[PDB]
Amino acid sequence: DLDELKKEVSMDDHKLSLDELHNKYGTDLTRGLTNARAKEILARDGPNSLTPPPTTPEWIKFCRQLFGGFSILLWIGAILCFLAYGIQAATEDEPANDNLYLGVVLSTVVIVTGCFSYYQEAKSSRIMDSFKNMVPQQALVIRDGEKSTINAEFVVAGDLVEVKGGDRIPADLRIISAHGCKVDNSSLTGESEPQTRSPEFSSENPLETRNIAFFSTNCVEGTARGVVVYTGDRTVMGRIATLASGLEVGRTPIAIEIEHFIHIITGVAVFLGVSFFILSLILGYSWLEAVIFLIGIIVANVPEGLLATVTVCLTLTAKRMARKNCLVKNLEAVETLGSTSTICSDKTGTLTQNRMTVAHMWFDNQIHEADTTENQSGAAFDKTSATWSALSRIAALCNRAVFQAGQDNVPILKRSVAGDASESALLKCIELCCGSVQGMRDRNPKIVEIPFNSTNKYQLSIHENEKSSESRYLLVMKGAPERILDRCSTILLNGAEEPLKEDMKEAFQNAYLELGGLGERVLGFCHFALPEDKYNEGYPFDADEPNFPTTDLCFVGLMAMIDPPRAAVPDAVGKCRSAGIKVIMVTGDHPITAKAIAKGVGIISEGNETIEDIAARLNIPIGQVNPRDAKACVVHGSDLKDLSTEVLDDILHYHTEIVFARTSPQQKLIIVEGCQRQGAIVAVTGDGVNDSPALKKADIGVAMGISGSDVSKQAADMILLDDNFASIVTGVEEGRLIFDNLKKSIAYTLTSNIPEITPFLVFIIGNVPLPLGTVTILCIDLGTDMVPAISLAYEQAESDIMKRQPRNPKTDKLVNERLISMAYGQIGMIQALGGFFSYFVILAENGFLPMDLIGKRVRWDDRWISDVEDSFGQQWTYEQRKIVEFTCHTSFFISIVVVQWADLIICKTRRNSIFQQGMKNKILIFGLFEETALAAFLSYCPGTDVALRMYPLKPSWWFCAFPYSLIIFLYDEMRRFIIRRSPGGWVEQETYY
Amino acid sequence: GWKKFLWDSEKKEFLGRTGSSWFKIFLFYLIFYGCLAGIFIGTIQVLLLTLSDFEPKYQDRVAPPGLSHAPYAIKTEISFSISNPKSYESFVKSMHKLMDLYNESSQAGNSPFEDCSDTPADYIKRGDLDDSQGQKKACRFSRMWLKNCSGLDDTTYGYAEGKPCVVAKLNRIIGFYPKPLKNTTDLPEELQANYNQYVLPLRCAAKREEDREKIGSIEYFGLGGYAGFPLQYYPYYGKRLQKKYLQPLLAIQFTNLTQNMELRIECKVYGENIDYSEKDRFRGRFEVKIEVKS
Ligand SMILES: C=C(/C=C\C[C@@H](O)[C@@H](O)[C@H](O)C/C=C/C=C\[C@@H](O)C[C@@H]1O[C@H](C[C@@H](O)[C@H](O)C[C@H]2O[C@H]([C@H](O)[C@H](O)CC[C@H](O)/C=C/[C@H](C)[C@@H](O)C[C@]3(O)O[C@H](C[C@@H](O)CCCCCCC[C@@]45C[C@@H](C)C[C@@](C)(O4)[C@@H](C[C@@H](C)CCCCC[C@@H](O)[C@H](O)[C@H](O)[C@@H](O)[C@H](O)[C@H]4O[C@H](C[C@H](O)[C@H](O)/C(C)=C/[C@H](O)C[C@@H](C)[C@H](O)C(=O)N/C=C/C(=O)NCCCO)[C@H](O)[C@@H](O)[C@@H]4O)O5)[C@H](O)[C@@H](O)[C@H]3O)C[C@@H](O)[C@@H]2O)[C@@H](O)[C@H](O)[C@H]1O)CC[C@H](O)[C@@H](O)[C@H](O)[C@H](C)C[C@H]1O[C@H](/C=C\[C@@H](O)[C@H](O)C[C@@H]2C[C@@H]3C[C@H](O2)[C@@H](CC[C@H]2O[C@H](CN)C[C@H]2O)O3)[C@@H](O)[C@H](O)[C@H]1O
Ligand SMILES: *[C@@H]1O[C@H](CO[C@@H]2O[C@@H](C)[C@@H](O)[C@@H](O)[C@@H]2O)[C@@H](O[C@@H]2O[C@H](CO)[C@@H](O[C@@H]3O[C@H](CO[C@H]4O[C@H](CO)[C@@H](O)[C@H](O)[C@@H]4O)[C@@H](O)[C@H](O[C@H]4O[C@H](CO)[C@@H](O)[C@H](O)[C@@H]4O)[C@@H]3O)[C@H](O)[C@H]2NC(C)=O)[C@H](O)[C@H]1NC(C)=O
Ligand SMILES: CCCCCCCC/C=C\CCCCCCCC(=O)OC[C@H](COP(=O)(O)OCC[N+](C)(C)C)OC(=O)CCCCCCC/C=C\CCCCCCCC
Ligand SMILES: CCCCCCCC/C=C\CCCCCCCC(=O)OC[C@H](COP(=O)(O)OCC[N+](C)(C)C)OC(=O)CCCCCCC/C=C\CCCCCCCC
Ligand SMILES: CCCCCCCC/C=C\CCCCCCCC(=O)OC[C@H](COP(=O)(O)OCC[N+](C)(C)C)OC(=O)CCCCCCC/C=C\CCCCCCCC
Ligand SMILES: CCCCCCCC/C=C\CCCCCCCC(=O)OC[C@H](COP(=O)(O)OCC[N+](C)(C)C)OC(=O)CCCCCCC/C=C\CCCCCCCC
Ligand SMILES: CCCCCCCC/C=C\CCCCCCCC(=O)OC[C@H](COP(=O)(O)OCC[N+](C)(C)C)OC(=O)CCCCCCC/C=C\CCCCCCCC
Ligand SMILES: CCCCCCCC/C=C\CCCCCCCC(=O)OC[C@H](COP(=O)(O)OCC[N+](C)(C)C)OC(=O)CCCCCCC/C=C\CCCCCCCC
Ligand SMILES: *[C@@H]1O[C@H](CO)[C@@H](O[C@@H]2O[C@H](CO)[C@@H](O)[C@H](O)[C@H]2NC(C)=O)[C@H](O)[C@H]1NC(C)=O
């Protein structure tokens, strides 16, 4: 799978002859191949079917999730825990079990997290499968001089293949004979209109010539013949799909922030250990015990609920997205939208609707605009003049297309119409504001029609007049406005008729250039009442000689048409530009149309100008003007092929409104890379196969759901099942909102750390009874902390999020030193002091004053000293003093919950005050209530002192942590106050997360 | 990267900041931590003011009282060879440490050791738990009372020829009055004889029914010759109000002990405000494993 030979732009053998072609692959132009020869080749190289994707089993996708995120930190934690239980078990028959529990718990936090993340990734895959539909297809091949329809998988290189309007081109063909055949090259090349396939050659580029049919394309109208030049995976879209499969994914931004988080967490772990190692050696301990102390401190610096909390956090935002029809296959792809700063979009199928619609109309010397939006939410065009009625009769009659049988259910715009795209657009507009055309057509019987001619350049027909008072004959004709203008002498103004003096002839010329400059295609409609005295009701006007007056007709008005953009396209582009997101158009369409759509959607702001526009406004050559005075630029693909790396960098560095036109799929990838070489996130939004390699390499691919291709749908990361484009705006908003909340939840789960390690440090250094047990830390680590941390995600915005610039990746991280200074430095310290207060209170009320506790650990833990004197002289047995230590653990845990109240409240808001935002978050309130109920339950249920070792507390001890909490609240409130009044000051660059 | 974030010479920065930054941050942390320390200290001083010096506010975790012993046996096992002298040294050093506090030289003069009844007697109340009448007075407890286990005649206390002693002791509790069982028809078998009301009885036995035969003659030594604690040494007024206070002791000689075999001996005190616990094996009773292997 040579990628460099697949990265190259397609080459071909188009510029040849029919004899050279038949001489190279071997084939009879009039008899085709022989069946024996056909099978010899079929077996020689392989069926004409693309290779299936590389599959994967479900246990594999579950192992990936098990060894991921920070499941490594926890895997070792678990392994270390069971190692210590092994050694402790084989060494003594009476070892503590703080390790068999610590290890099965840690392990569960990893297995459970993997199951949840998994379930998510499977849910998305099923709905993805219910879309991959495949109805078998069969092609028409001519062998031994006979026509046969065989499965698409049996076509080989060399046989003759015939196509008919409505069928799909089986393989890459070389047209040999055509009969007004047109094909839809929208998915592969990106051409919105049907390009006619002619046996003659026209352009050096194989994608532009007409003598080649392509894979996955469809023949709109006409029939054609051709020799199969390319077959199987070796086809154009085969090499493209192969390129998509042989590319990388990338590395999500969110995954880099989490990696940096683990980096800092380990930094502080080895720091606390090497330091308490030198300190313990300064106190007289040996090297074996001191080494074991360095192990215990590193293990304590492991947030286990941070994994489950972060997973639930990410999972919550994805549901909000799925409620509005935005599905993500992975789980972290939910944040990439908010961090995006450059959106590369596609035109055909993404920015547009890929369907032709009547845009502007000319009548009564006045331009009228029609509604060209999917759901028909706009302005009508004043249907009160007689002119419009005559126009409806002209277009509705002189038109041969008709809705496809059985569409009585779909809407007027999304139904299937058999015919050209122009007659279809006209039929839809008439059926839209003029009622049923089928009755309008049966109301006037068509007598004689002369089909569109290459010489006449017009389409005319005569029908009877439904006027019950006028039995005359009506004649209507449509065609190019110039040809029709040369055939009139009257004008239907407001109903009456008038001559064609040069005043209205010039108004017609300016109208023609107005509709033409708009990138639209205009047509002219005229009609005339045939005198029933010279052509009675019985006379038959056979289409042979001049039976109708070609000239002296009555011109009614012009009718333009073009593919309009989707409803929320301009507003969404404006919203993205408002948020500081650079919008760059990248499409393989004609530049004359790309520039117009760009100006119409907001990419090229009205007023900005290109170098050619300046040369045209001044009437001077283009090589004289300076390119720095041009803000917007249109880069052609042909020119893009010959450009250096620095030139592309300068193109993106100096032009703010860029539009890349006539770019091949391979070139689309080069543009995305040119944006990433400089340092920023990219989101590619597309639909066809030409978009497959761009969505894969982009930081986040957005594929259309209904109008998208299966390859680009399988290679993307986000799917728009409703084809609505406003979802992009919703995504960029949610991506930010869920980011500031992760910051809050991390500072919350990190604040509780300090009051969890300090007891052991003072234990080894100061020699006092153990303040915080292991089964209590587990109760806080996975009990109290979680619900509140999960609730911190439901926090609304503080300021307008859709107003700030995109975050810089090289400077604004997710976890900086400003957070560590708060959680580890200021709040956690106060929480630890409060805990040590409740501790000393419990031991002083029972008999051990703070002066006699220093130096007691060695005898406090001896199992054979049944007489330990306290500050008053009482003798305490071993189990009696242990019961008090356990009650001190219970109250320490309750103190943690009490200080967590004020921590969850000061963590709710980052800058704003509580009296401003407000406690409108019901989940947070529920978190506080549940957090308290759980602590009371664990401390007063019969049987806890035998299972978990938590004894009941006396009512006066629950109030030992209240002052510390109030103080935490007041300190953080004044902290958030100086930041507001003093922007950019010390408190901001020192404590503003 | 590696080098610049460590020390650049244009902005004169170390690790990231300049000299004035490290100073602003260090000064802030010093003031912050100083305030934290002062607040914690104030909240601890008010705690020193809340409690009383002559009496622990809560006395529910130490009741009833335990029963400790000397020597200091690890795992509650006393195993030693009658030949190798370096086998029972860890035991004798403890026994001696305990008895070394009852030396007559320590108990001298009128204070604060007053002479009490040589025969068990009733309680003695030296007033309330106040500082009004100064330091209270405690009864004297002579070493010699313990006849064959006193370290005055046979320093080793018995371990020298296969006859060990075990000095039992009741855990000191402030304001605790020991209450012995009454003479009513319901009383254990053992306790019937020598019902000295003023004496709290202590009686050892065998954990299993089999071991009975392998255990010989349990000879208890104590005040007045009884196997108990005289009620006159109660109650205890606490260290602050009764420094130089001695708690009664009871010696137990396990004469006629079978050789080369682990014997489980359970000793138990009896009384009203005495209750045992299936979890704490030292509350009221105690277990000892003796094996005089020779
Ligand atoms: C399984 C674990 C590990 C242990 C588990 C353990 O329990 C058990 O499994 C047991 O092990 C079971 C194992 C059993 C194994 C076998 C047994 O079955 C079998 C039986 O074992 C029994 C024993 C058993 O009974 C034992 O007792 C068990 C205990 O073992 C440990 C003991 O204590 C202790 O270790 C005993 C071990 C042994 O004795 C050690 C001997 C020495 C090594 C060695 O010396 C001996 C000897 O010499 O070794 C020789 C071999 C040599 O080649 C080796 C070469 C030596 C290299 C020398 C270089 C040294 C070095 C190294 C440099 C890097 C740095 C440097 C500084 O030092 C540098 C300096 C140089 C220059 C020094 C050069 C010196 C040279 C020395 C050498 O040459 C030799 O010494 C020399 O050759 C000697 O021969 C010679 O004699 C020398 O003597 C002298 C030398 C000196 O001595 C020596 O040098 C000294 C002192 C050095 C001093 O440091 C110097 C100081 C003074 C100082 O410098 C000084 O001055 N300062 C002065 C200050 C001053 O003035 N200040 C003035 C101030 C003025 O202002 C002399 O000087 C020298 O000249 C001379 O040469 O170079 C050779 O073999 C021989 O020679 C040999 O004798 C302890 C335990 O292990 C165990 O209980 C036997 O009796 C029995 O017979 C046998 O059958 C995993 C742990 C768990 O993971 C963890 O949970 C753990 O459980 C907790 C931590 C427990 C803790 O907490 C518990 C309660 C609750 C906990 O459980 C909770 O879990 C806590 C949790 C933790 C965390 C956090 C939190 O809380 C919770 C939250 C977590 C959760 O929440 C999270 C979310 N937040 C999520 C989740 O994570 O989890 C407590 O209960 C625990 O108690 C507590 O610990
Ligand atoms: C409480 O009483 C303890 C015993 O008191 C003795 O008996 C009472 C009834 C009185 O008569 C009193 O006057 C007696 O002293 C008392 O402990 C005793 O302290 C002395 C002084 O250190 C010890 O004497 C020394 O003995 C060692 C050898 O001891 C051996 O036996 C003991 C057991 O008894 C073992 O533990 C040892 O390991 C030895 O096996 C002698 O080597 C030592 O020599 C020193 O004196 C000689 C002159 O005699 C000098 O030439 C040397 O240089 C040395 O300076 C002493 O003779 C005595 O052993 C010790 N008794 C016990 C049982 O340990 C205790 O201190 C008192 N405590 C208080 C708080 O009042
Ligand atoms: C029994 C007793 C109990 C003991 C309990 C102890 C509890 C432990 C509590 C806290 C742990 C402290 C450990 C240190 C934490 C430092 C935080 C840290 O390392 O965070 C990382 C930051 C990175 O941040 P960033 O993402 O913005 O980088 C962007 C870089 N880009 C953009 C250029 C790529 O790196 C930096 O900050 C740069 C590194 C700065 C390191 C400063 C080291 C100071 C440590 C000790 C000082 C002690 C002196 C005491 C004497 C004072 C004089 C009187
Ligand atoms: C000595 C002891 C020390 C203890 C220290 C720890 C303390 C921590 C616990 C509680 C702290 C409470 C702080 C009180 C803050 C009140 C703030 C407030 O009231 O700000 C008013 C807001 C603002 O409104 P607005 O103008 O934006 O509205 C606009 C409406 N429009 C749009 C229609 C116009 O109004 C709103 O938020 C809407 C109404 C919300 C009403 C909330 C009431 C619930 C408050 C607390 C719950 C109790 C938790 C107890 C935990 C213990 C469990 C056992
Ligand atoms: C919207 C949805 C709302 C849902 C809310 C649900 C809330 C549920 C509320 C209560 C149900 C809790 C479980 C009930 C446990 C009953 C245990 C019990 O009745 O025990 C009685 C006996 C004690 O007998 P004794 O006094 O003779 O023992 C003397 C022992 N001596 C003398 C040796 C010391 O027990 C024993 O013996 C053995 C003790 C067995 C230990 C079982 C405790 C379970 C341990 C941890 C699970 C707790 C996780 C927290 C879940 C929070 C959910 C919100
Ligand atoms: C969403 C919010 C979740 C909130 C839940 C809080 C999370 C809790 C997190 C960690 C706590 C789990 C630690 C497990 C502790 C097991 C302790 C154990 O095994 O001790 C063994 C004891 C033996 O004691 P001994 O030697 O003194 O007996 C002497 C008996 N003599 C003397 C009479 C013979 O035997 C006994 O207690 C026998 C009774 C057995 C009791 C088993 C209780 C298991 C409790 C929890 C496990 C399920 C938790 C799953 C929820 C995860 C939440 C994420
Ligand atoms: C911003 C900070 C907010 C902090 C809020 C903290 C709330 C704390 C809640 C309750 C306090 C604990 C309950 C105290 C119960 C003690 C029971 C007790 O046994 O007490 C006895 C000792 C006195 O012993 P003695 O030796 O002198 O007796 C000598 C007797 N003879 C003269 C006869 C010899 O009593 C004493 O120490 C009493 C000394 C206590 C002094 C601390 C006062 C705490 C301040 C305010 C409490 C909150 C109430 C107002 C609520 C406002 C809501 C917004
Ligand atoms: C049980 C737990 C109890 C805990 C109680 C804690 C109370 C302690 C609270 C605060 C004490 C710390 C005060 C430190 C003052 C020295 C700091 C200093 O040297 O600062 C210098 C700067 C002036 O330099 P610059 O910005 O002009 O230079 C620009 C330079 N460039 C560019 C780097 C920004 O100072 C400034 O900015 C002004 C900023 C001053 C910091 C205000 C922080 C106030 C926080 C809390 C006070 C509220 C206590 C409420 C307690 C109620 C108890 C019931
Ligand atoms: C101490 O125990 C010994 C047994 O070890 C008792 O003496 C034995 O008595 C039986 C008769 O009942 C004789 O057959 C043995 O020969 C005796 N053995 C020895 C070593 O004397 C002795 O009576 C017990 N004494 C006390 C006071 O309990």
Ligand SMILES: CC(C)CCC[C@@H](C)[C@H]1CC[C@H]2[C@@H]3CC=C4C[C@@H](O)CC[C@]4(C)[C@H]3CC[C@]12C
């Ligand atoms: C709001 C903050 C900054 C106030 C902090 C006040 C500090 C400085 C106060 C509060 C309580 C005070 C202590 C209260 C009681 C005593 C006992 C006395 O025998 C020596 C002084 C000493 C130890 C005091 C020292 C100063 C002290 C710790």
Ligand SMILES: [Mg+2]
């Ligand atoms: Mg497309």
Ligand SMILES: [Mg+2]
């Ligand atoms: Mg991707």
